[PDB]
Design an enzyme around this catalytic site. Sequence first.
Site, short mmCIF file in Angstrom:
data_model
loop_
_atom_site.label_atom_id
_atom_site.label_comp_id
_atom_site.label_asym_id
_atom_site.label_seq_id
_atom_site.Cartn_x
_atom_site.Cartn_y
_atom_site.Cartn_z
N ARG A 165 7.42 -3.56 0.35
CA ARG A 165 6.55 -2.44 0.02
C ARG A 165 7.24 -1.42 -0.85
NH1 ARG A 165 3.08 2.45 2.48
NH2 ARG A 165 1.02 1.60 1.99
N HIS A 215 5.63 -0.32 -4.32
CA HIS A 215 5.31 1.04 -4.63
C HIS A 215 6.11 1.64 -5.76
CE1 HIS A 215 2.53 2.64 -1.37
NE2 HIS A 215 2.29 1.39 -1.78
N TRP A 268 -1.07 -7.79 10.75
CA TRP A 268 -2.12 -8.60 10.15
C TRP A 268 -2.14 -9.97 10.75
CZ3 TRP A 268 0.66 -5.16 7.07
CH2 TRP A 268 -0.12 -4.29 6.31
C1 HEM Z 1 -5.66 -2.62 -2.38
C2 HEM Z 1 -4.20 -2.50 -2.42
C3 HEM Z 1 -3.38 -2.25 -1.33
C4 HEM Z 1 -3.51 -1.26 -0.43
C5 HEM Z 1 -4.61 -0.22 -0.38
C6 HEM Z 1 -2.35 -1.29 0.44
C7 HEM Z 1 -2.18 -0.47 1.57
C8 HEM Z 1 -1.19 -0.57 2.54
C9 HEM Z 1 -1.19 0.14 3.80
C10 HEM Z 1 -2.23 1.14 4.31
C11 HEM Z 1 -0.10 -0.31 4.49
C12 HEM Z 1 0.46 0.21 5.82
C13 HEM Z 1 1.65 1.10 5.58
C14 HEM Z 1 2.13 1.75 6.82
O1 HEM Z 1 1.33 2.21 7.62
O2 HEM Z 1 3.34 1.79 7.02
C15 HEM Z 1 0.54 -1.30 3.68
C16 HEM Z 1 1.68 -2.01 4.07
C17 HEM Z 1 2.33 -2.96 3.31
N1 HEM Z 1 1.86 -3.36 2.05
FE1 HEM Z 1 0.23 -2.77 1.04
N2 HEM Z 1 -1.48 -2.30 0.10
C18 HEM Z 1 -2.10 -2.90 -0.99
C19 HEM Z 1 -1.50 -3.88 -1.75
C20 HEM Z 1 -0.23 -4.35 -1.51
C21 HEM Z 1 0.46 -5.26 -2.39
C22 HEM Z 1 -0.10 -5.71 -3.73
C23 HEM Z 1 1.72 -5.48 -1.84
C24 HEM Z 1 2.86 -6.14 -2.33
C25 HEM Z 1 2.90 -7.42 -3.01
C26 HEM Z 1 1.74 -4.71 -0.60
C27 HEM Z 1 2.73 -4.86 0.38
C28 HEM Z 1 2.79 -4.27 1.64
C29 HEM Z 1 3.82 -4.45 2.62
C30 HEM Z 1 4.99 -5.42 2.55
C31 HEM Z 1 3.55 -3.66 3.67
C32 HEM Z 1 4.33 -3.62 4.98
C33 HEM Z 1 5.04 -2.32 5.34
C34 HEM Z 1 5.89 -2.32 6.62
O3 HEM Z 1 5.62 -3.07 7.56
O4 HEM Z 1 6.83 -1.53 6.70
N3 HEM Z 1 0.58 -3.99 -0.43
N4 HEM Z 1 -0.14 -1.47 2.47
O LIG Z 2 1.28 -1.76 0.24
#
Ligand code: HEM
Ligand SMILES: [O]
Length: 293
Positions: free
Chosen positions: A47, A51, A190
């Site tokens: 992430r 980001h 998830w």
């Molecule tokens: C419509 C687009 C996307 C949205 C709105 C989104 C939103 C989010 C949200 C709300 C979380 C939870 C963060 C937290 O509460 O700590 C998250 C986690 C995460 N997202 Fe996304 N995301 C999107 C696309 C992506 C993409 C394209 C990737 C990377 C290829 C990505 C990778 C991750 C990863 C790895 C986490 C895990 C964080 C952790 O466990 O510490 N996201 N994302």
């Molecule tokens: O994300």
Amino acid sequence: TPLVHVASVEKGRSYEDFQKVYNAIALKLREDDEYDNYIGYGPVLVRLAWHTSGTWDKHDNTGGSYGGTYRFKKEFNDPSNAGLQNGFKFLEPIHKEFPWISSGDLFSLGGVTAVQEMQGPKIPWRCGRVDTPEDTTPDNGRLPDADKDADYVRTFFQRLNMNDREVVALMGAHALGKTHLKNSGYEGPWGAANNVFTNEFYLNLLNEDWKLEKNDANNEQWDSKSGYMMLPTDYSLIQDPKYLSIVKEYANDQDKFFKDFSKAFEKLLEDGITFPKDAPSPFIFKTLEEQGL
Ligand code: HEM
Ligand SMILES: [O]
């Protein structure tokens, strides 16, 4: 006048040099496995990669992974980045042992290493991102909102020159780690396999029985009996006909997903960067397991 960010390899640095940095992050990933109730640090490192790359605007070449502006208070402090200072802190010991690598090379290599180390696809990486001034830090608001639909997602991703196929492959990384309520106001994994890269996100989306329910931060999310959750933006990939087809595709062909994700994640981390023809070929790093380490 869109900006031109041309790559500059760090002086003298070749493959051995960046393979050493990859092994440092990999060895630290093994050692610090307790994090976030044993998920380890892989997910949040992916992430951060995403980001620090995803601020790009293709219209003016502002944002992106080139100049590592995440190290400046503005971007660091963006609300959408709530949580990634865990990842930044992870990387700190490594940048001190290799003070020579640039911030965007470290932030983007961090995510390559996390995917590969979690048994994800080999992702080719190219060096040369150069730290640019505090003033180049884009403003907050460029990263996506989780509460929106398929139309939001399509239009959002057009800004980083990502097509539907590329968006669905990219979203498969949400098989990793979890949403944490204090960070985003969303809560849950998830799926089961939180820290090994698989196409589990697609299988879950198609086969779990989701229910639209509101969470303690009073936001709706989709919940499964088995303890899993999808964000509204995640769920929209089965609501839309063009996205549902590609989800059904990755659901039934693990290798296609691996292959497309690698292409799309390499592209997202390279957006905005001009590579000279004299610049080296992308590196493919061995994992510790291929190095018998
Ligand atoms: C419509 C687009 C996307 C949205 C709105 C989104 C939103 C989010 C949200 C709300 C979380 C939870 C963060 C937290 O509460 O700590 C998250 C986690 C995460 N997202 Fe996304 N995301 C999107 C696309 C992506 C993409 C394209 C990737 C990377 C290829 C990505 C990778 C991750 C990863 C790895 C986490 C895990 C964080 C952790 O466990 O510490 N996201 N994302
Ligand atoms: O994300």
